[PDB]
Amino acid sequence: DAYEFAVDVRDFSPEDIIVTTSNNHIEVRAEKLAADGTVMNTFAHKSQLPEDVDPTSVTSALREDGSLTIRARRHP
């Protein structure tokens, strides 16, 4: 059975986005860098996947509305 949630990263481009998992912790992060390479705009969304979801199965996609979707499978 599928698990999915959406994160609003509409102010950022795909190349700006990072998805991290640590066990069942998931972080969607986005940054824009200035010319000097410092951070001009930063965003992070930290949440926890349900116990019955497999963290290794997480995939992400940028949806047409500009948000990012996290999809993952549950263990049966």
Q: Where are the domains of the chain?
A: 2-73
Question: To what resolution in angstroms was this structure determined?
Answer: 2.2
Q: What angle do CA 23, 6, 33 make, to 5 degrees?
A: 80
CB-hemisphere CA count at 13 Å for 18? 11
Look at the block and give the residue holding tokens 């102010």.
11
The answer to whether the CB of 28 falls within 8 A of the CB of 45 is: yes
The answer to whether the CB of 43 falls within 8 A of the CB of 12 is: yes
Phi, psi of 15 (to 5 degrees): -70, -15
| Residue range 2-73, CATH number | 2.60.40.790
